[PDB]
Design a protein around this motif. Structure first.
Motif, PDB file in Angstrom:
ATOM      1  N   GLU A  72     -14.190 -40.366  26.121  1.00  0.00           N
ATOM      2  CA  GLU A  72     -14.579 -39.868  24.798  1.00  0.00           C
ATOM      3  C   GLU A  72     -15.745 -40.688  24.244  1.00  0.00           C
ATOM      4  O   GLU A  72     -15.717 -41.918  24.282  1.00  0.00           O
ATOM      5  CB  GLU A  72     -13.415 -39.937  23.799  1.00  0.00           C
ATOM      6  N   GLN A 274     -17.780 -28.720  28.914  1.00  0.00           N
ATOM      7  CA  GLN A 274     -18.319 -29.159  27.624  1.00  0.00           C
ATOM      8  C   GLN A 274     -19.700 -28.567  27.303  1.00  0.00           C
ATOM      9  O   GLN A 274     -20.016 -28.325  26.139  1.00  0.00           O
ATOM     10  CB  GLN A 274     -18.297 -30.680  27.469  1.00  0.00           C
ATOM     11  N   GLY A 278     -18.202 -27.674  24.198  1.00  0.00           N
ATOM     12  CA  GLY A 278     -18.339 -28.937  23.461  1.00  0.00           C
ATOM     13  C   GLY A 278     -19.139 -28.846  22.166  1.00  0.00           C
ATOM     14  O   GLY A 278     -19.419 -27.752  21.670  1.00  0.00           O
ATOM     15  N   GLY A 281     -22.002 -26.799  22.241  1.00  0.00           N
ATOM     16  CA  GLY A 281     -21.655 -25.907  23.334  1.00  0.00           C
ATOM     17  C   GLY A 281     -22.233 -24.515  23.191  1.00  0.00           C
ATOM     18  O   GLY A 281     -22.336 -23.980  22.083  1.00  0.00           O
ATOM     19  N   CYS A 284     -19.270 -22.555  21.795  1.00  0.00           N
ATOM     20  CA  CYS A 284     -18.380 -23.220  20.881  1.00  0.00           C
ATOM     21  C   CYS A 284     -18.215 -22.566  19.523  1.00  0.00           C
ATOM     22  O   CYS A 284     -17.117 -22.098  19.200  1.00  0.00           O
ATOM     23  CB  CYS A 284     -18.837 -24.668  20.684  1.00  0.00           C
ATOM     24  N   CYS A 289     -14.068 -23.947  20.871  1.00  0.00           N
ATOM     25  CA  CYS A 289     -14.522 -25.334  20.783  1.00  0.00           C
ATOM     26  C   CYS A 289     -13.474 -26.293  21.353  1.00  0.00           C
ATOM     27  O   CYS A 289     -12.370 -26.408  20.820  1.00  0.00           O
ATOM     28  CB  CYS A 289     -14.853 -25.699  19.340  1.00  0.00           C
ATOM     29  N   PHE A 291     -13.415 -29.487  21.394  1.00  0.00           N
ATOM     30  CA  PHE A 291     -13.188 -30.694  20.606  1.00  0.00           C
ATOM     31  C   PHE A 291     -12.800 -30.409  19.144  1.00  0.00           C
ATOM     32  O   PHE A 291     -12.964 -31.257  18.266  1.00  0.00           O
ATOM     33  CB  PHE A 291     -14.389 -31.634  20.723  1.00  0.00           C
ATOM     34  N   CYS A 306     -18.850 -35.831  22.875  1.00  0.00           N
ATOM     35  CA  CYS A 306     -18.875 -35.427  24.275  1.00  0.00           C
ATOM     36  C   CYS A 306     -17.998 -36.344  25.109  1.00  0.00           C
ATOM     37  O   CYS A 306     -17.560 -37.398  24.644  1.00  0.00           O
ATOM     38  CB  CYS A 306     -20.311 -35.459  24.838  1.00  0.00           C
TER      39      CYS A 306
END
Ligand SMILES: *[C@@H]1O[C@H](CO)[C@@H](O[C@@H]2O[C@H](CO)[C@@H](O[C@H]3O[C@H](CO)[C@@H](O)[C@H](O)[C@@H]3O)[C@H](O)[C@H]2NC(C)=O)[C@H](O)[C@H]1NC(C)=O
Ligand SMILES: *[C@@H]1O[C@H](CO)[C@@H](O[C@@H]2O[C@H](CO)[C@@H](O[C@H]3O[C@H](CO)[C@@H](O)[C@H](O)[C@@H]3O)[C@H](O)[C@H]2NC(C)=O)[C@H](O)[C@H]1NC(C)=O
Ligand SMILES: OC[C@H]1O[C@@H](O[C@H]2[C@H](O)[C@@H](O)[C@H](O[C@H]3[C@H](O)[C@@H](O)[C@@H](O)O[C@@H]3CO)O[C@@H]2CO)[C@H](O)[C@@H](O)[C@@H]1O
Ligand SMILES: *[C@@H]1O[C@H](CO)[C@@H](O[C@@H]2O[C@H](CO)[C@@H](O)[C@H](O)[C@H]2NC(C)=O)[C@H](O)[C@H]1NC(C)=O
Ligand SMILES: [Fe+3]
Ligand SMILES: [Zn+2]
Ligand SMILES: [Zn+2]
Length: 341
Positions: A72, A274, A278, A281, A284, A289, A291, A306
């Motif tokens: 991370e 990702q 991400g 993205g 995303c 998404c 994350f 990321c």
């Protein structure tokens, strides 16, 4: 080779994983278990490929032969020219947090108070604070230090689980997964916010991310940063803006682990996944998404910009750092080298 089996911890992570699986066109599929330890076991058996883990868990996984793959990476203010994937990670700040209104509580008066922990075996929530407490008291009876706690993963009937709340139905009290109301960074901070506990062992980011309108969740909607203080090791109390000078430790970032034989392929797939789902993205904002999970930190922390490359192809010990590794080993002497499973 081109299919990754992710391991989701508990039903909420399973739901997110299923969504990811659909959107990835089955390039990623899902295995689920009740606890992080159970997920590590699935990976060890070859029944899942990978999952993203706190450093305390990386220690468990690494003792069993699993290797770090990608870490991370949150937003920063150094190495600003490099791409996130190639930017070095900085690590997070493990803190002890209390209410401003709880006057006169300091690091040195924690004994017999009420505590909120992310989970047993986690870095900021457990290994760091309990390691420090064991050392200072010269005692392995860390289970009798606080009057009551919520430490998901402990014996449910014990004082270490007494403040845990379980789910909507009051089921799964003290389970180390998102079903437990007070689980993880956000759950442990909620435990403090609601005055269930006197102290929460979390990270700096958690405080910022759940105060001053950053959350919108009912318990968090109305929380003000100035109503919280950090406990420094010198017995001092500081505002939550001072975390760089008032923390318990710097922690290695949560990271993806897998079997050595699967690491290269897990890495390839994730970098592609990702790029699609991400931060910036392709799909995303729009389809999915990876994350985000409305502050529930499911699969990955919601503040992840990321997953970054490691470099130096580190062993789990090199990733965690010799410092932290010895601290964990020293603490585990209370509960010398082998896989726990
Ligand atoms: C709890 O107390 C433990 C015992 O004192 C302590 O472990 C000790 O950690 C220090 C520092 O990490 C190690 O000292 C090291 O010092 C330098 C670091 O560059 C190295 O050159 C040395 O080789 C050495 O490793 C001690 O070796 C280590 N002691 C033992 C017996 O393992 C923990 O750090 C304490 N836990 C917490 C959370 O603070
Ligand atoms: C403690 O945790 C805090 C939350 O992670 C963190 O604050 C965050 O720091 C970053 C930069 O370090 C800020 O920068 C962001 O916002 C600006 C505009 O507002 C943008 O230009 C940047 O792209 C970036 O996204 C965050 O705004 C800030 N987060 C919040 C919600 O306050 C602290 O830095 C941490 N403290 C320590 C000492 O590490
Ligand atoms: O690079 C090889 C070398 O690594 C040493 O460990 C490093 C880790 O690689 C690194 O991630 C870590 O970095 C930070 C982390 O947040 C915490 O460990 C904190 O305490 O320090 C850093 C703050 O940014 O540092 C450790 C070293 O402390 C291994 O010890 C070594 O064996 C190996 O050769
Ligand atoms: C699922 O994985 C496959 C295999 O990697 C992806 O198909 C590749 O797409 C890349 C990137 O555009 C191309 O460079 C390759 O030529 C493709 N390879 C093959 C054999 O198909 C696919 O894009 C992935 N799908 C999703 C949605 O994740
Ligand atoms: Fe953590
Ligand atoms: Zn420090
Ligand atoms: Zn190395």
């Amino acid at each position: 080779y081109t299919r990754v089996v992710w391991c989701a911890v508990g039903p909420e992570e399973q739901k997110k994983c299923q969504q990811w699986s659909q959107q990835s066109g089955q390039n990623v599929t899902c295995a689920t278990a009740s606890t992080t330890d159970d997920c590590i076991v699935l990976v060890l058996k070859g029944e899942a490929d990978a999952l993203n883990l706190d450093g305390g868990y990386i220690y468990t996984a690494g003792k069993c032969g699993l290797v770090p793959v990608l870490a991370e990476n949150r937003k920063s203010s150094k190495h600003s020219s490099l791409d996130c994937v190639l930017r070095p990670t900085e690590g997070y700040l493990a803190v002890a947090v209390v209410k401003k209104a709880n006057e006169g509580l300091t690091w040195n008066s924690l004994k017999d108070k009420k505590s909120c922990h992310t989970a047993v075996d986690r870095t900021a929530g457990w290994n760091i604070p309990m390691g420090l407490i064991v050392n200072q008291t010269g005692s392995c009876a860390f289970d009798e230090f606080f009057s009551q706690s919520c430490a998901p993963g402990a014996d449910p009937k014990s004082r270490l689980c007494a403040l845990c709340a379980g789910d909507d139905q009051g089921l799964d009290k003290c389970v180390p997964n998102s079903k437990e109301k007070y689980y993880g960074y956000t759950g442990a901070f909620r435990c403090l916010a609601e005055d269930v506990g006197d102290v929460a062992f979390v990270k700096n980011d958690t405080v910022w991310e759940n105060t001053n309108g950053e959350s919108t969740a009912d318990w968090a909607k109305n929380l003000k940063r100035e109503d919280f203080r950090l406990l420094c090791l010198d017995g001092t109390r500081k505002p939550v803006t001072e975390a760089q000078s008032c923390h318990l430790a710097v922690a290695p970032n949560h990271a993806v682990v897998s079997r050595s034989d699967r690491a290269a392929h897990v890495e390839q797939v994730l970098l592609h996944q990702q790029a699609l789902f991400g931060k910036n993205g392709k799909n995303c904002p729009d389809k999915f998404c990876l994350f985000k999970s409305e502050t529930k930190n499911l699969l990955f922390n919601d503040n992840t910009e990321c997953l970054a490359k490691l470099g130096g192809r580190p062993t789990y010990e090199e990733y965690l750092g010799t410092e932290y590794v010895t601290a964990i080993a020293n603490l585990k002497k209370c509960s010398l080298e082998a896989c726990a499973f």
